[PDB]
Amino acid sequence: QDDPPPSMLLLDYQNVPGIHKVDDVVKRLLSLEMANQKEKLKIKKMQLMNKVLENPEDTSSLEARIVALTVKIRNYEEHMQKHRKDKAHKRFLLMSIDQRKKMLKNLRETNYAVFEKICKELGIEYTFPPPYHRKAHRRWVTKKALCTQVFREVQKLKKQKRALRAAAVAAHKQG
Amino acid sequence: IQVHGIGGGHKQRYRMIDFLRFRPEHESKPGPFEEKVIAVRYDPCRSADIALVAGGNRKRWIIATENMKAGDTVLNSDHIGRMAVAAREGDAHPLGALPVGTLINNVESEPGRGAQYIRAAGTCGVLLRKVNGTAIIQLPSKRQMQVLETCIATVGRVSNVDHNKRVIGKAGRNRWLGKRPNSGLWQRKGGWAGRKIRPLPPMKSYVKLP
Amino acid sequence: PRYELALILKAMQRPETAAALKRTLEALMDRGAVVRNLENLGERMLPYKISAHNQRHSRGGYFLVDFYAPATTVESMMEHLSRDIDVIRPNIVKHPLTQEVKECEGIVPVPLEEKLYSTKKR
Amino acid sequence: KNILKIRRRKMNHHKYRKLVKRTRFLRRKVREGRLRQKQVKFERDLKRIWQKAGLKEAPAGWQTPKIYLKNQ
RNA sequence: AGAGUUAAAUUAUAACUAAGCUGUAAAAAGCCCUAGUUAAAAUAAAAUAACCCACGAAAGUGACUCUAAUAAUCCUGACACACGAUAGCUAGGACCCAAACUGGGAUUAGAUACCCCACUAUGCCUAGCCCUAAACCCAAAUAGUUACAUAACAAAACUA
RNA sequence: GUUUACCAAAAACAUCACCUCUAGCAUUACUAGUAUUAGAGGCAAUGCCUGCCCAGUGACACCAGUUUAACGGCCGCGGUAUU
Ligand SMILES: [Mg+2]
Ligand SMILES: [Mg+2]
Ligand SMILES: [Mg+2]
Ligand SMILES: [Mg+2]
Ligand SMILES: [Mg+2]
Ligand SMILES: [Mg+2]
Ligand SMILES: [Mg+2]
Ligand SMILES: [Mg+2]
Ligand SMILES: [Mg+2]
Ligand SMILES: [Mg+2]
Ligand SMILES: [Mg+2]
Ligand SMILES: [Mg+2]
Ligand SMILES: [Mg+2]
Ligand SMILES: [Mg+2]
Ligand SMILES: [Mg+2]
Ligand SMILES: [Mg+2]
Ligand SMILES: [Mg+2]
Ligand SMILES: [Mg+2]
Ligand SMILES: [Mg+2]
Ligand SMILES: [Mg+2]
Ligand SMILES: [Mg+2]
Ligand SMILES: [Mg+2]
Ligand SMILES: [Mg+2]
Ligand SMILES: [Mg+2]
Ligand SMILES: [Mg+2]
Ligand SMILES: [Mg+2]
Ligand SMILES: [Mg+2]
Ligand SMILES: [Mg+2]
Ligand SMILES: [Mg+2]
Ligand SMILES: [Mg+2]
């Protein structure tokens, strides 16, 4: 969670000359204190593309689009930690996550090093799509848990029988 | 035996609970003060949860509000104001200074008597209106109470809200709390039984009109 | 300006009117508003009787405060001006000079619509 | 026109609702017995799973919970 | 999706006046703690604008203000994921008005209906479900054409 | 779990849960508590539910009127469709 200062001096008013000679009133007006949430979003988006991106002027690049989408997903998760019962914004968050996943797969199938750089830097863990998406119901999870436990007991009894057999072999071979 | 079905409970120590919310240490400075909440503990005597409140050179156990946590700041005052106050969950203020839609607890009856009403867990009264220098509140039994406006009350609902939804698993838990079983005598219901629909009793007033 | 406060006050005399305006502007400055100017529209008889703070009023003064404020403190401003009793109605809107007048270039005459029904013979 | 088909489906649904209301508790008994046979068949299936792997008793800490006979 | 607010009505409750008020094609029942005027909280719903056709993916949304905000450098795609009008279910609260059910009064050969009166669940808020509609604009999504051409009706016929 | 110690240990009583009533309150019970509380009772966890009735007798209202998860009650006679 990066923390912009209140005196950030927002995006549209950074590169104009003669700012620091102007008094505290206009600097306070042009800072992030009376700014909107979208100005802070632009500030975070600019800082994050300057942090992770290679060549910042290209907006059409897939990694820059993933950066913008990641900013939007972080804003949506902040909105979801505020409001729990919104369904439209929850839908927007899930399709935003899905588009970021699709573009991450597209970036992975073309350029691996840049994809690895974005994957390490953003904290995103790319999870591979599992085949055969089925609803895991109570009977299936119960039978799967039982089958795993039976397999563990089978291998444990086989290990104990092999250890006892090896002990008997060593015992009769010693004399 | 004067009250039936009481006895055989767990051993309980009693905590000295201070009911008067505004209690200055010394009479040299009668002004409003601000204290610090250290911890919130369970009390076996009542359904509520209590809090240890320290200021000056003394501590008091008070009845805790809903979101009072460890290491909190709580303001106690008697100052009535015509801009009222911005009520937090911890503050103790007189009823004349509170806004109209204020939820309150530990309501004082007579000025200087101390808090008597609205003490159980999760119960809160609501201020209704303030007319002619007199406050009218609504109790958890939905009865209107007329009180002098200088009586101190604490804003908020009493802690342990889910005490009503607490389930008792067995008769052993009742015997742990100390409630002996009811008698086995079969008593036929009289005329007192039944669903009685009664109109609401009138407003109970403790303001003495000269 | 960014925000505009439509502030309808109680009809009262000059010194406590100025005092109420004083504490209103210090209440704005405590939440952090940078106020540009104050406007008086005078005192007028209200369009309708407004019940506020256990009173019925018919006459009141109209005042405007415009300011730059953070988006989080507008609720605190509205809460304080709701608890204030010398005001009968406070409201905070976005200032209309923030938006710019998009162009009325004229009324485009709409044609009557064609091709709604088939070319069958009735 | 289509109102004939609509009225036929309406009459069928009304008669089925009257059948459900008249024979509610018989259907409740049938459903309860069917859930019993469901749970029993599940138990026999799991028992076959641990017997065909060579074990005699079920693995320790397995209480074979009732997934169909849950309270309403 | 939250937070704040109330103009037109309506009502609890008071003060004057009247003996009637409501009810329909016509009547009865009901109310006379009634009716009219003047003052008025709480709840519910948001005339005109709207002869407008916007937003949202759909359901849906048109009293006011503020906050957050409406994916995809934009193809199709599930049994996976997330929503889903009203009605209905558990717990808490609110209840002006409407009203299933019910009880009366009319009508009828009968009326457990259409007409009238009163009231309950419910319609409202918070929290969790239920996942159903003539969910229909009965016309699938994305790119295009006006070439060939009228089963009938309807919203013209059609390519990938 | 409890009960007729010395003829009856139970299907009896109690019990979690679910319901009714009665109470806005201070120095010996309840209680050093304050309606999510405390008493007077009923029935028995949980699941589906708990239909109709204030005509009588009670209880509130001190007369009207309201109450059955209050005491309690919930129909005859006769003819008809291929018996
Ligand atoms: Mg005790
Ligand atoms: Mg306790
Ligand atoms: Mg009992
Ligand atoms: Mg008994
Ligand atoms: Mg059929
Ligand atoms: Mg809401
Ligand atoms: Mg009559
Ligand atoms: Mg009311
Ligand atoms: Mg409207
Ligand atoms: Mg879009
Ligand atoms: Mg798709
Ligand atoms: Mg739904
Ligand atoms: Mg509903
Ligand atoms: Mg109702
Ligand atoms: Mg009838
Ligand atoms: Mg529709
Ligand atoms: Mg269809
Ligand atoms: Mg499709
Ligand atoms: Mg023809
Ligand atoms: Mg036993
Ligand atoms: Mg005994
Ligand atoms: Mg014996
Ligand atoms: Mg025994
Ligand atoms: Mg014996
Ligand atoms: Mg028994
Ligand atoms: Mg129940
Ligand atoms: Mg039972
Ligand atoms: Mg019964
Ligand atoms: Mg009676
Ligand atoms: Mg009676």
Q: How far apart are CA B5 and CA B28, in angstroms?
A: 50
- For residues B82 and B143, state if they share a domain: yes
- For residues B10 and B56, state if they share a domain: yes
Chain position carrying tokens 């009222």: B84
Question: Residue A154: its chain D contacts at CB < 8 A?
Answer: 53-55
Please tell me the distance in Å from A34's CA to the nearest CA on chain C.
Answer: 4
Write the CA distances from B71 to A85, B50, B115, B161, integer angstroms: 32, 14, 24, 21
Quick check: C70 and A33 CB within 8 A?
yes
What CATH number corresponds to the domain at position B39?
2.40.50.140
Q: CA gyration radius for chain C?
A: 23
Q: Is C91 on the interface with A (CB under 8 A)?
A: no
In this structure, is residue B189 part of a structural domain? Answer: no
- For residues B2 and B71, state if they share a domain: yes
Write the CA distances from A173 to A163, A166, A168, B116, integer angstroms: 15, 10, 8, 89
CB B20 within 8 A of CB B114: yes
* Resolution number, Å: 3.5
In this structure, is residue B118 part of a structural domain? Answer: yes
Provide φ and ψ at A153, rounded to 5°: -70, -35
Question: Residue B83: its chain C contacts at CB < 8 A?
Answer: 83-85
Q: How far apart are CA C50 and CA C21, in angstroms?
A: 20
- For residues B83 and B139, state if they share a domain: yes
In this structure, is residue B169 part of a structural domain? Answer: no
Structure tokens at B131: 């007319």
Per DSSP bridges, beta strands B152-155 and B103-105 are: antiparallel
Quick check: A150 and D67 CB within 8 A?
no
Please tell me the distance in Å from C75's CA to the nearest CA on chain B.
Answer: 13
- For residues B88 and B47, state if they share a domain: no
Burial label for D9, CB within 10 Å (0-12, 13-18, 19+), is exposed
Q: How far apart are CA D65 and CA B190, in angstroms?
A: 49
Beta carbons within 8 Å of B20's beta carbon, 6+ residues apart: B108, B114, B115, B152
Q: Is C34 on the interface with B (CB under 8 A)?
A: no
B82 marked ligand binding residue: no
Q: Which residues pair with B155 in a beta bridge?
A: B104
Quick check: B83 and C83 CB within 8 A?
yes
- For residues B5 and B60, state if they share a domain: yes
Q: What experiment produced this structure?
A: cryo-EM
Q: How far apart are CA D55 and CA D52, in angstroms?
A: 7
Q: Is C84 on the interface with B (CB under 8 A)?
A: yes
Question: Chain F positions under 7 Å from a protein CB?
Answer: 13-17, 20-26, 29-30, 32-44, 46-48, 54, 57-61, 66-72
CB C80 within 8 A of CB C33: no
Q: How far apart are CA A72 and CA A51, in angstroms?
A: 17
- DSSP letters of B31-55? S-EEEEEEEEEE-SSSSSEEEEEEE
Per DSSP bridges, beta strands B115-117 and B107-108 are: antiparallel
CB A86 within 8 A of CB A79: yes
**Taking Cα atoms as reference points, which of B74, B100, B99, B77 lies closest to residue B31?**
B77
CA atoms within 13 A on the CB side of A71: 19
Q: Which residues pair with C37 in a beta bridge?
A: C66
Q: Could you say which of B83, B129, B131 has the minimum Cβ distance to residue C84?
A: B83
Q: How far apart are CA B77 and CA B82, in angstroms?
A: 15
What CATH number corresponds to the domain at position B95?
2.30.30.30
Q: Which domain holds residue B3?
A: 1-77
Structure tokens at D4: 């004939």
Burial label for A63, CB within 10 Å (0-12, 13-18, 19+), is buried
Q: Is A148 on the interface with D (CB under 8 A)?
A: no
C-beta atoms surrounding B107 within 10 Å: 23
Write the CA distances from B149 to B94, B135, B209, integer angstroms: 7, 5, 14
**Taking Cα atoms as reference points, which of B128, B130, B123, B95 lies closest to residue B110?**
B95
Please tell me the distance in Å from C39's CA to the nearest CA on chain A.
Answer: 21
Q: How far apart are CA D10 and CA C122, in angstroms?
A: 38
Sign of CA dihedral C85, C89, C93, C96: negative
- For residues B89 and B148, state if they share a domain: yes
- Domain count within chain B: 2
- For C4, the enclosing helix (H) or strand (E) is strand C3-10
Burial label for C55, CB within 10 Å (0-12, 13-18, 19+), is exposed
Provide φ and ψ at C92, rounded to 5°: -120, 125
Q: How far apart are CA A26 and CA A40, in angstroms?
A: 18
C108 touches strand E (CB under 7 A): no
What are the residue ranges of helices labelled H in chain C? 14-31, 74-83
Q: Is A146 left (phi over 0), alpha (psi -120 to 50) or beta?
A: alpha
In this structure, is residue B27 part of a structural domain? Answer: yes
**Three-class SS state of C108:** coil
Beta strand ranges found along C11-112 (DSSP E): 34-51, 56-68, 87-94
Smallest CA–CA distance from A27 into chain C, residue? C34
Q: How far apart are CA B137 and CA B144, in angstroms?
A: 6
In this structure, is residue B188 part of a structural domain? Answer: no
- For residues B64 and B2, state if they share a domain: yes
> Looking at B54, B77, B100, which one is the last position of a domain?
B77
**Three-class SS state of C44:** strand
Q: How far apart are CA B176 and CA B162, in angstroms?
A: 20
**Taking Cα atoms as reference points, which of B132, B103, B140 lies closest to residue B207?**
B132
Chain position carrying tokens 């079905």: B5
**Three-class SS state of A153:** helix
> Looking at B32, B53, B77, which one is the last position of a domain?
B77
**Taking Cα atoms as reference points, which of D28, D38, D33, D47 lies closest to residue D67?**
D38
Q: Is B8 on the interface with C (CB under 8 A)?
A: no
Write the CA distances from C4 to B81, C28, C68, integer angstroms: 28, 12, 9
Q: Is A48 left (phi over 0), alpha (psi -120 to 50) or beta?
A: alpha
In this structure, is residue B204 part of a structural domain? Answer: no
In this structure, is residue B153 part of a structural domain? Answer: yes
Beta carbons within 8 Å of B158's beta carbon, 6+ residues apart: B48, B63, B64, B65, B66, B105, B118, B119, B120, B121, B122, B123, B124
Helix/strand/coil (H/E/C) assignment for every residue in D2-69: HHHHHHHHHHHHHHHHHHHHHCHHHHHHHHHHHHHHHHHHHHHHHHHHHHHCCCCCCCCCCCCCCCCC
Beta strand ranges found along B15-159 (DSSP E): 33-42, 49-55, 58-63, 72-76, 92-94, 103-105, 107-108, 115-117, 125-131, 134-138, 144-148, 152-155
**Taking Cα atoms as reference points, which of B155, B19, B152 lies closest to residue B95?**
B152
- For residues B60 and B104, state if they share a domain: no
Structure tokens at B82: 């015509």
Q: How far apart are CA D15 and CA C103, in angstroms?
A: 65
C-beta atoms surrounding A94 within 10 Å: 12
Beta strand ranges found along chain A (DSSP E): none
Q: Could you say which of C32, C34, C71 has the minimum Cβ distance to residue A36?
A: C71
In this structure, is residue B68 part of a structural domain? Answer: yes
- For residues B62 and B94, state if they share a domain: no
Structure tokens at D28: 């409740």
Beta carbons within 8 Å of A67's beta carbon, 6+ residues apart: A45, A48, A49, A52, A53, A118
Neighbours of ion ligand 3 (CB under 5 A): B 182
> Looking at B77, B111, B139, which one is the last position of a domain?
B77
Q: Which 67-86 positions of C have CB less than 7 A from strand E?
A: 71, 74-75, 78, 82
Name the residue type at position A96: S
- For residues B8 and B31, state if they share a domain: yes
- For A174, the enclosing helix (H) or strand (E) is helix A138-174
Q: How far apart are CA B20 and CA B92, in angstroms?
A: 10
Question: Residue C34: its chain A contacts at CB < 8 A?
Answer: 25, 28-29, 34
- For residues B67 and B46, state if they share a domain: yes
